[PDB]
Design a protein around this ligand. Sequence first.
Ligand SMILES: *[C@@H]1O[C@H](CO)[C@@H](O[C@@H]2O[C@H](CO)[C@@H](O)[C@H](O)[C@H]2NC(C)=O)[C@H](O)[C@H]1NC(C)=O
Ligand SMILES: *[C@@H]1O[C@H](CO)[C@@H](O)[C@H](O)[C@H]1NC(C)=O
Ligand SMILES: *[C@@H]1O[C@H](CO)[C@@H](O)[C@H](O)[C@H]1NC(C)=O
Ligand SMILES: *[C@@H]1O[C@H](CO)[C@@H](O)[C@H](O)[C@H]1NC(C)=O
Ligand SMILES: *[C@@H]1O[C@H](CO)[C@@H](O)[C@H](O)[C@H]1NC(C)=O
Ligand SMILES: [Ca+2]
Lengths: 172, 172, 172, 317, 320, 320
Amino acid sequence: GLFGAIAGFIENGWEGMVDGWYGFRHQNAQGTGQAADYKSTQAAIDQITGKLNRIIKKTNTEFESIESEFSEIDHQIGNVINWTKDSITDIWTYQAELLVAMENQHTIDMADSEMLNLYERVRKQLRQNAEEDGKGCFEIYHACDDSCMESIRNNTYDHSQYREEALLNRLN
Amino acid sequence: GLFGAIAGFIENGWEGMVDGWYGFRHQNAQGTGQAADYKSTQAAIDQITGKLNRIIKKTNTEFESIESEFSEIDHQIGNVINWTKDSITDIWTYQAELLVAMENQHTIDMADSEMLNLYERVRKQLRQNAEEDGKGCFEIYHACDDSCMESIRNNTYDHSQYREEALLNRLN
Amino acid sequence: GLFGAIAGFIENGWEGMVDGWYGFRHQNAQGTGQAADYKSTQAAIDQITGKLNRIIKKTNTEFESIESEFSEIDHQIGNVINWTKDSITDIWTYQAELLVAMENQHTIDMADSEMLNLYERVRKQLRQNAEEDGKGCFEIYHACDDSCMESIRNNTYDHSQYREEALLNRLN
Amino acid sequence: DPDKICLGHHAVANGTIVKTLTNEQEEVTNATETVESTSLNRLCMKGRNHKDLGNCHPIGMLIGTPACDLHLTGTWDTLIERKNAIAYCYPGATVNEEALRQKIMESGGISKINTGFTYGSSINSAGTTKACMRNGGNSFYAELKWLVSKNKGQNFPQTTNTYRNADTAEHLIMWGIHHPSSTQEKNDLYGTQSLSISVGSSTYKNNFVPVRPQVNGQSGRIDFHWTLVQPGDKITFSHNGGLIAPSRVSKLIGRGLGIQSEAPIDNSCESKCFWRGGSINTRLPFQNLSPRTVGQCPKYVNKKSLMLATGMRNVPE
Amino acid sequence: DPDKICLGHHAVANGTIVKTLTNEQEEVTNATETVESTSLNRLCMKGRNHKDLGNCHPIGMLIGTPACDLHLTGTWDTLIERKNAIAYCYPGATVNEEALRQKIMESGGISKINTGFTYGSSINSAGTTKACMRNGGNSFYAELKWLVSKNKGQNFPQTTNTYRNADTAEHLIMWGIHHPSSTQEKNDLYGTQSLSISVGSSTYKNNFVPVVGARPQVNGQSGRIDFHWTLVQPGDKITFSHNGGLIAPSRVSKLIGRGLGIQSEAPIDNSCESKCFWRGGSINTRLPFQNLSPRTVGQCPKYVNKKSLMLATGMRNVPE
Amino acid sequence: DPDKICLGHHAVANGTIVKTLTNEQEEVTNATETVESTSLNRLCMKGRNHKDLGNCHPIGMLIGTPACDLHLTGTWDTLIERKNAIAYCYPGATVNEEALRQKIMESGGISKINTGFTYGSSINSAGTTKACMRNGGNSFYAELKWLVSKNKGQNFPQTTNTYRNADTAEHLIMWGIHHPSSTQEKNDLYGTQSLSISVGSSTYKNNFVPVVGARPQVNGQSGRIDFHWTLVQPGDKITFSHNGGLIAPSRVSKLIGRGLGIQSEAPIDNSCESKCFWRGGSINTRLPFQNLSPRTVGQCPKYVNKKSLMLATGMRNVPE
Ligand SMILES: *[C@@H]1O[C@H](CO)[C@@H](O[C@@H]2O[C@H](CO)[C@@H](O)[C@H](O)[C@H]2NC(C)=O)[C@H](O)[C@H]1NC(C)=O
Ligand SMILES: *[C@@H]1O[C@H](CO)[C@@H](O)[C@H](O)[C@H]1NC(C)=O
Ligand SMILES: *[C@@H]1O[C@H](CO)[C@@H](O)[C@H](O)[C@H]1NC(C)=O
Ligand SMILES: *[C@@H]1O[C@H](CO)[C@@H](O)[C@H](O)[C@H]1NC(C)=O
Ligand SMILES: *[C@@H]1O[C@H](CO)[C@@H](O)[C@H](O)[C@H]1NC(C)=O
Ligand SMILES: [Ca+2]
């Protein structure tokens, strides 16, 4: 994937996570938690909604019959219509195939990017109090309880609180 | 957005900046300043110029009249013409809407990507002498006078000049 | 480019590397070497193979002759055919140009992304045992022999094995 | 030893395959169809002032064939022809038949204006036949009149009727010529005199001479012709007997949607797109039911399915 | 409080809304239009050897109507036709009117060639009428001759004319047939006997009998002269056997080269250059699309059902 | 110096220039073409039962012109028409010629069914002509008969002939109408009476009158035999009522199946296969587009107004 997270440095998805598209899983002394990230989940859904609104739509152009169903037409003009209709059908078939293939590509990468933008947001929050696992996780180098974990998820984590403790744990 | 900088970790744009698209704002002992970045500003504008050269364009095909303004046309062929012209117009309306939408999407993300590239280039220069703010800034851990700041902006800042000093300020 | 590696922080490509698209050069006490990364190369190649499978194709639509080569067509209907064919040709010329231009843009940026994903995979793998040079290289702060360099390429490098030594050299 | 926080994304057990620019078999968390495959076999006429012609052919509406009696006038925003629809109770064809049919289906209603044509005392304008049966008895085309002599042998008087167009719009007028196969049949009907018919007007003008397999057990034929009478113009028919005459003329008002189908009606469902097989009431942009459609429609494509991704790559555990 | 350097990007107060793949109200810094709505009300004819017909109608200049005296011959790359143009001074209609008109508008010039049709002493080749007024007096079409008998009342002689196409290219030949609307007028000009007019080439064949009936009076004339035409190929003849009633050609036309056929009411302007035209005027624009009209001619932007389509020329606008 | 590991990508000395959305001169490591420029000047007929008509025009198969004696019946999936091919030996033309030609060029074979028409003593039905030569002697259309009075000057009898389609598919019936060069010739052949020819079926009604008059000699013949045609459905009857002037069919045609019609000057080559053809030959490209011709037949790539469109199959080339 373009941004390297989904089907990339993150091994796989989580069938357990039903309350959102992106989110967190932590482990600390006191146990284990899971929570969706609303902002990144909604940013992805909103962007896909806009595609559906643009794509799931037809023109408001009135088309009358040029081919009689129950009677013969002149063979020359019938062939001119058959050539034109097949030419227009080839265009729309191609346009549809391209549209869908291009949007599917864009959707997959857009979703990949939102995962990465959430990850990079957490990396900068934690600053020097954590290190990258490689597998989409952050090994935090201090005691981080559920209120600390909630602060990282809700973006109220202040690295300086835990800096003095964390740098010592990182160094020895 | 895709690359996470513009309308992302950089919380807003700078209306004050009028000599560039991307740029710097510093604060040191000598006070606050601001400067544009030429290389990244041109990369963005050049890419946008190319689009305008490619899209602001009509075909050289000489189309002649097949419908008369000042007189009636045969009824069966005029319906074939009307059907055809309407179909061609639905194609072009669709192709125009898709083009512009796709290019706008790409334009926005390309610009977002130049902001990130400039950020990543500065980050890598400063190396272990600075730390990421999370809002698109770098807190530098030594005395960085206006010449040091100019050396960061001009891609000539040498990290090993201030490394020993800055590593002590960070560890503390 | 979009992902900032190819024609970005990687100064240039290697004309010597001829058994792969992406790969490693290293220097140590034992000498210099080069090797290609198979997995990242095939990722870029397979995506391009996919493009060719979709694009290198014609519609399986039988078209008949509506214009006679060896005789005078009726003047009014021949103008309609001439107008129609020219409209279809403008659509297909425009579509072909837009198809290739867009795909060319995506291919370039796709290949850029795979260079960056490999770089980021190595960065996270080395962890605190290395520092980014800024030109796509990593200055490793310990004795890394050919087998150590082989484990960086083959994704079996254990950072904790060299961490004690490496942190001491980095801080000095 | 150290605590951990892990970023991740959702997945599902049953993913969906879509095609991207690079990958033909790309599994995503969710997808939705863009090409409509399902077709309702019912003409959806909700909110439509419509006229199902059924057994009536649009030509026959203008001349008043026995099957068309219920459709000689009306107003509509939709008109529905059917297969094997009766146009002629007495055998024949229109002069420019398929050009007329499409003009009627392009219009949104018919109103008939009386020509007010009187004939003499010798002539008899009520020429009934056993072919065009109406009301359980011998009858004729409602908008035309069969002109035969009251004296069964006597020669037909050289009569001329005229019609001026009163209304501000164009009026459509239809007539024809009766020919039996033999000469002996023709002579008793309208006299031995070698007569002919000629209609004259502002733009249109032509002469017609009464000149195969049998249809509906009748020996003779009735060949129909037509032209648009201009507003403030006089159509005068000059004949010497043996030509059926228009009692009324037609006026086409506005425009409407000419549907052609075999499928039955349903006023519960609504639609803007129609085809021979039925209706297409889909929100999707594309469609693979028929290239022949009418109205505001999704575009025909040579594709069974095209799945648009509505979620991320599916990466199971 | 350590020393700080901040990366950032510009913004504006008057940001423009554009459409993207995902967002219908996306605000960017700058943008530009792709669908043209403005149109000049003037036929831009710089660098164009044009021909404004004005009163004249394209068919008219083959037969030679009074209005088309200035346009009987000449070469051009563009040919402009106006509304209500006079094709026929003496009333009547051309069979395949529209096919003939298109082929003239498509051409880039006209050359005339003489038929060399001489007529006997008993024929009056210079017949004229009050409908077609030339130099303020009675006249006829320039490229045809109204053939009536010299003595009033007598029969018209069985004469036969034949034009040879000596040229290496095809010529267009035209001819009228007088439908007199009076048995008095039919007899005293042509004759009592039934008239028959026969035409025949290698590729064309037809017979014409003048019908007579009181048609409505227009231009002060109840009769009609209906025209017919064909193309005589290189090295081929065309015969005109007629026992009265025919309006034979004195000259035949040769449509030469190619040219743009413009139908519009708007006036000329020889200072401005353009390549796209329509009824309302010219479309001189760099933009790819337009919403003025679906019916245009020349090198045009494509017609789209859109008032506006804004193409972003800058990043997302994110104000403070 | 510390131990180093450097990430990098490949490059090539001589790269390739492609166009992106933003750049018209973008150097990449490899590219490939999408528009076919080359054509084989040959008709690739491998795995195709084909018929090269040569000198025979497809209409000539139906009326049986001498040129089409080896093409009166047959079956094929491909039918090849050539320039200056002969439909008419005796001069004339078919009404809706291009409709009929296209219908034949769309078929996959012809069958012939005898019509079985018979005529009285007074009719001479073997009247040959010098315009249509066969086996070094005067002849006529193999599938038609010229019906003329056996006694010169005598009126042609009011004859009636009828063909019922006994088959379960539609049959294509053709007939000619002779148009004599003078009132002498018309009276010599069909007598002094007024001629009328009526053709009637359930689905077809038409009347024909021989137009008579002077016109040029084509193949040394002033007279014209114009042709007409219709479809007679299974079970339906078609009756010809005529009193001289009819060129009556002796055989009718059935068009069988489906085939691809090609108009080309290029020679056959049974070694190569193809599904696309144009005037100049075959197009065997796997590419999506093509700039050879807008006029093509079969399963073709789409015509585009471009010399070359290079599709990048590699990254940016940034050489050392
Ligand atoms: C135009 O195309 C239509 C559709 O391919 C042709 O109609 C088919 O014709 C034959 C019967 O005559 C059969 O293959 C099918 O029953 C018809 N298909 C449909 C959908 O009705 C038609 O013949 C073509 N017209 C011309 C002039 O060639
Ligand atoms: C074609 O479209 C024009 C403009 O909408 C309309 O006025 C005209 O009636 C149409 N032509 C026919 C033959 O229906
Ligand atoms: C149509 O185009 C062809 C090829 O460009 C040209 O030769 C021909 O003259 C045109 N036909 C008509 C009827 O305008
Ligand atoms: C990958 O490379 C390492 C380092 O040389 C080697 O020890 C290991 O065996 C390799 N992996 C596999 C699966 O062979
Ligand atoms: C997929 O997305 C659509 C909206 O486009 C939603 O209504 C549907 O329920 C989703 N499908 C599944 C299986 O969850
Ligand atoms: Ca066909």
